[PDB]
C-alpha cells in the first residue's frame, strides 16, 4: 500500500477516463451504434432525440454489465473491506472479469492482427492477453458486430420500402415518390410488431 | 511500457512521502540519530515530488482532453 | 395559465400561420395545376416547365398581398407581446 | 554544461504542453484519423462509430505504429537520463533523430524542396543536415496528401455499389426512388463481409512501412 | 531617457501579452487562416483537416514568409538594444519601420484613405509618416479582402467538377441521384493530383 | 422602422431578383418548350431531351448578358451600403 | 442594419436556387455554388471599406 | 481586381466545363435520340428501354476519352492556383 | 536567419548558468573559502532569483499565447 | 488628437523619471556628497516605489479587462 495522497491523484485521474472506459471497455459502442443504424432505417435522422438514444443505450449497458458488476463487486469491492486482498492484488483482480467477458466478445483475427503489431511472439495462451492487445482488438470487434446488427434491422425496412416502390409502379404510378407512403406503414410494422422490445431481448441476447 | 514508467514514478514519490514520514514519526517519539533539520529538508522533498507529479497529472490530463476533442 | 388557454394559444398562432401561407401556396398550387392540364391538353410533358411560371406568380403574390401578410404578422406578434404578463403563472 | 534542476524541470514542463502538437504533426495519427474522418463519409453514415471511438482507436494504433521509435527513443537517449549519464541539452539532441529518420522517410522530396527554398536555405549536404523547421511541415503536408490518397482509393467500392444499385433502380423505371438508403445497408454489408476494419488497419499500417 | 529595468520589464511582459494580436492583425496569418477554410470548405470536407494541423501549417507559414522582417528587426533594432548599445524607446521605434514598411506593402489605398479621412487626420506627405493607428485597419482590412478574393478564386475548379458531374448524372435521367456523393471522391482525386497542398502554399506565399 | 420602409425595399430588392434571373430562365422555358413541341410532333417518347438544349441555352445566355447583370447587381449594393446610414433614420 | 445587410446574398441564393432547379438540377444543394458568389459580390463592391463607411456614418 | 477580370476568368472556367462534359453529353444525347426514334418507328412504347444503352455509350466514353477529360482539366488547374499571386489588387 | 528556438535556447543558458555561478560560489563560501564575502554570496542569488522568475513570466505568457492560438475554429 | 498610447507613455516615462530620480540620488548619499539627507532619500525612495506599484495596478486592470473584451464570442 502506496501513500494515501497518491491513491486519491491516482483516483481522480483515473475518474477522467470514465467515458474512456464507457466507450472501449464496455458494449456501449454496439447499442449507440444499433442505434444509429436503426434510426437511419426509419428515414428520420431526429425523430428520437440523441439525448434518449444515449441514455437508452446507458441503461442497456448498465444491465449487461450487471453481471460483471456483481463479479466485480465480489471478487473487488468486497476483499477490499476484509482487507484479505487490496490495493494492487485486487484492483487486478477486479478487472479479471472485464478481461474476461472482453476475451468472450472479442474475435480472434483482431487479437491476431494487434498482436503482430506489437511483436508479441510468445503470446500463447488467451487469458495472458495484455490490455494493449486486448482493448483495440475488442473495439473493432464490436464495430463489426454492430454493423451486422444494423444490416440485419435494415433488411425487413428495406424490404418495405421496395414493396411500395413496386406496387406503386405497378399501380401505373410513375411519379410518386415511395418513401412518403412506405414512412406510416414502416412504423405500423415496427409498432405493430413490438420491434423495440424484441431487439433489445436480442441484443441482451448478442451479449 | 508507458503505464510501467507511470507506475514506477508513483513507487518513487509515494516511497518518498512513507520516508519522510516515517522519519518524522520517530523523531516525535524522541528516538535518538534523527535531526530536526533533516526532517524538515525530507518533507520539504517530499512535498516538491509530490506536487510535480501534480503538475505532469494536469499536462497530462490537459493533453487528454485537447486530443479527445478534436473532429474526426 | 389553464391548459385551454394554451392549446388555444396553439391553435391561433397556427391558424396565423396558415392564413399568411396560404396566399402564396394556393397560388402556387394553381398555377401548376393549370400548366399541368394544359400540358395534358397540348400532350407536352417536360419537367421544368412547369417551375418557371411557378416562380413569377408566388413573386407577384408578395407584391399584391405582402403588405397585408406584414400587417397580420405585427398585429398577432405586438397583441401576444403585450398579452404576455397577463397569461402568467 | 548541465542546466540546473530548476530550468530542466521548467522545460520539461514546459514541452509538456505541446503533446497534441507533437502527436498531430510528428506521429501518424495525422493520416489515421483524417483517413476515418473520410471513411464514415464514404460509408454513408456521417454519425458512424461516434467520434471518441474513431479517436482512441487512431490513437492506439498510432501508438502501435511509432512503438519501434519510441524504443529507439527509449533505448538511446531516456535510458542514460535516467542512469545519469546524459544531459537534458544532449538527450534532446540525441533522441529526435529516430523520431527525424521516421518523418523523413514519409516525406515528399517536393514539399521538402518547397520549405527549403521558401526558408532560403543554404545547400544541404544530405537528409542528415535537414533542419526540423523545414522537415516539420514538409512533413505534415506530404502526410495530407497521403490521407487524401488512401481516402480517395478508399471511396471507391462504395461508389460502384452506389452506380450499381441506382441504375437498376433506374433500368426498371424506378426513377422516384432515392437509391442513397437503399444502398447503405449494402455498403454496411460490404464493409462487413470484407472485414473492412481490420483490413483497413492493417493497410494503414503497412503503407507506414 | 532609459526606462530603469523595472519599467523594462513590465513592458516586455505587457507587449508579451498582446502576441496573439500581433500575430493576427501585423503577420500574414490571418490571410492564410482564412485561404484555408475556405479551401476546407471548398472541398466538401469540413472537418477533415482538424484545426490544429491548418494552425499549426498556417503558423510555420507565417514565419517563413515573416523571416525577412524578423530578420531586419534583429539586426537593426533588437541587436543594438541587447549589447545595450540603444535604450528602449529606440529600438522600438527602429523595430517599428521594417514592419510598417512590410504592411504598407500588403495594403490598398482606399482603405488608407478611409481610415484617415474617417480619424480626421491632416495631409500627409508620402508614406513616410503614417501612423500605426491609421495602418493597422487599413491593414487588416486589405488583408480580409485578399483573403475572400483567394478563397473565391480556389472555389472556381470545385464548382466546374460539381456541375459536371451533376450534367453527367442529369443527362441519364438520375433525377434522384446526389451529385455530392459522387463529386467528394473525384474533388480530393483533383486536389491530389495537382499537387494541391503544396501548390497552394507556395501561391499563398508567392502573393507576400 | 416602418412596414413601409421595409416593404419598399424588399420591393426594389426583388425587382432586382427578378431582373437578374429573367434572362436565364427565359432562356430556358423557351428551349424547353421548343425541344418538347418537336418531340411531340413526331412523336418521340423520351424524357431527357431537352437537358442539354436547356444547359447549352443558359451557358450562351450567362455568356452573353453576364457583364450585365453583375454590374447591375453590383450597382445595387453599392448603393443600397451608401444608403444604410439614412435607412435607420 | 443587420437585416438590409442581409437582402444582397439572399437574392443570390434565390436567383441560383431559381435558375439551378429551373434549368432541372434540382439534387445540387444552392448555397454550395453560391457561395463562391457572394465571396465575389462581397470582393467586388468593396464590401468591407463601404460597410466601414456605412457604419462611421451611421453616428 | 476589376469585374471584367471575373467574367474573363469564369469565361475560361465554364469553356473547360464544356468541353470536359461534351464527350459525355454529346453520346447519351446521340444513343438517347438514335434509340428513341428507332422505338418511334417501331413502335415499341416503352420509355425505359433507351437508358440501357446510353450507360454503356457513357462508360465507352470515358474508357475511350477519361485521360483527356483527366488531363486536360489538371493543366487548367495548375495555372490557376499558379496564377494566384497576379489576380489580387 | 533569426531562429526563436535558438533565443529560447540562449535565454535559458544564460539563466542556468547565473545560477550555477551563485550555486557555486555558495558552495565554495560554505566551504570557507577565504576570499569570498556574504553580501556578495546573498546578492548573486537573489539576483538570479530574479533572473529565473523573469524567465517563468515569460514562459507563462508564451504558453498563454500558444494556447490562445492553438483554440481557433480556422 | 488624444492617443492613449501617448498617455500610456507618458505616464510610464514619468515613473521612470522618478524612480531614476531616486537611485541617483541614493547614489550621491552614498558617495558622501554634502548637502544630501538621509530621511530625503527614503522618502523619495518610497515615493519611486508607491509610483512603481500604482503602475504596476493599473497595467493590472487594463490587461485583465482587454483579456475580458477580447475573449468574448462574436
Same mark, same amino acid.
Not at chain 1, 39 to 55: C, D, E, F
Given at each position: 500500500?502506496?501513500?494515501?495522497?497518491?491513491?486519491? =491523484?491516482?483516483?481522480?485521474?483515473?475518474?477522467?477516463?470514465?467515458?474512456?472506459?464507457? =466507450? @472501449? @471497455?464496455?458494449? $456501449?459502442? &454496439?447499442?449507440?451504434?444499433? $442505434?444509429?443504424?436503426? &434510426? /437511419?432505417?426509419?428515414? !428520420?435522422?431526429?425523430?428520437?432525440? /440523441?439525448?434518449?438514444? =444515449?441514455?437508452?443505450?446507458? $441503461? =442497456? !449497458?448498465?444491465?449487461? @454489465?450487471?453481471?460483471?458488476?456483481?463479479?466485480?463487486?465480489?471478487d473487488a469491492y468486497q476483499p477490499f473491506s476484509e482487507q484479505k486482498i487490496s490495493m494492487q492484488e485486487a484492483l487486478d483482480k477486479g478487472a479479471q472479469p472485464l478481461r474476461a467477458f472482453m476475451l468472450r466478445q472479442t474475435r480472434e483475427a483482431d487479437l491476431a492482427l494487434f498482436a503482430r503489431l506489437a511483436n508479441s511472439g510468445p503470446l500463447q495462451g488467451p487469458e495472458a492477453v495484455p490490455m494493449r492487445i486486448l482493448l483495440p482488438a475488442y473495439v473493432t470487434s464490436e464495430l463489426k458486430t454492430a454493423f451486422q446488427i444494423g444490416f440485419t434491422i435494415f433488411i425487413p425496412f428495406l424490404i418495405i420500402d421496395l414493396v411500395i416502390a413496386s406496387v406503386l409502379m405497378a399501380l401505373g404510378m410513375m411519379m410518386v415518390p415511395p418513401a412518403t407512403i412506405a414512412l406510416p406503414f414502416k412504423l405500423m410494422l415496427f409498432v405493430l410488431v413490438d420491434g423495440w422490445q424484441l431487439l433489445m431481448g436480442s441484443l441482451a441476447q448478442s451479449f | 511500457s508507458f503505464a510501467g514508467q507511470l507506475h514506477a514514478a508513483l513507487d518513487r514519490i509515494s516511497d518518498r512521502q512513507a520516508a519522510a514520514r516515517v522519519q518524522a514519526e520517530k523523531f516525535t517519539l524522541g528516538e535518538p540519530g534523527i535531526a530536526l533539520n533533516d526532517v524538515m529538508a525530507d518533507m520539504q522533498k517530499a512535498s516538491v515530488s509530490m506536487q510535480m507529479g501534480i503538475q505532469v497529472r494536469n499536462k497530462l490530463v490537459a493533453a487528454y482532453q485537447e486530443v479527445m476533442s478534436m473532429q474526426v | 395559465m389553464t391548459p385551454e388557454s394554451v392549446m388555444m394559444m396553439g391553435t391561433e398562432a397556427m391558424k396565423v400561420a396558415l392564413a399568411l401561407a396560404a396566399p402564396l401556396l394556393l397560388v402556387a398550387l394553381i398555377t401548376g395545376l393549370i400548366i399541368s392540364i394544359l400540358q395534358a391538353a397540348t400532350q407536352i410533358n417536360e419537367m421544368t416547365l412547369s417551375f418557371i411560371p411557378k416562380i413569377v406568380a408566388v413573386f407577384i403574390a408578395i407584391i399584391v398581398a405582402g403588405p397585408w401578410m406584414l400587417n397580420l404578422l405585427l398585429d398577432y406578434v405586438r397583441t401576444l407581446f403585450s398579452n404576455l404578463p397577463y397569461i402568467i403563472g
Open positions: 500500500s502506496w501513500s494515501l495522497s497518491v491513491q486519491t =491523484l491516482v483516483f481522480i485521474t483515473s475518474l477522467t477516463f470514465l467515458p474512456a472506459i464507457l =466507450l @472501449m @471497455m464496455t458494449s $456501449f459502442t &454496439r447499442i449507440i451504434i444499433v $442505434f444509429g443504424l436503426l &434510426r /437511419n432505417a426509419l428515414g !428520420t435522422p431526429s425523430a428520437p432525440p /440523441n439525448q434518449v438514444l =444515449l441514455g437508452l443505450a446507458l $441503461f =442497456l !449497458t448498465f444491465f449487461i @454489465m450487471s453481471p460483471v458488476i456483481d463479479k466485480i463487486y465480489v | - | -
